[PDB]
């Protein structure tokens, strides 16, 4: 519906991959969207991000609370593929939850 993966092609979102990981083999390449049963919360601008190893999910939601400009206090929670999430790094999160396309997909949901 418009996410990621129907925009973008499977082999395409392989390649962009390989480029992450040949550029920047350091970096976790993660896809952020809205949970599609979630309405309240806005949609973002960009859906694809590239973080250090060493971030935690915590780290990640200030991210995208930062770039919703949400209240600091407005209660939110990330999905992975969809089960709930917090102190896991990206290099964990990734080695238990990467697509075969090798992107870690999260949504954001209020509820």
Known sequence: PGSFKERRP???RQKDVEEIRSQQPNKV????????GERSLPLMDRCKFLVPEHITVAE??????????????????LLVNERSMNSMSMSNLYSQERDPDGFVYMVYTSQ
Not at 29 to 36: G, L
Not at 60 to 77: G, N
């Open 60 to 77: 990640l939601m200030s991210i995208v609370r930062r770039r919703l400009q949400l209240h600091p206090q407005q209660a939110f929670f």
């Open 10 to 12: 499977f082999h395409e």
């Open 29 to 36: 390449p993660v896809i952020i969207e809205r949970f599609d």
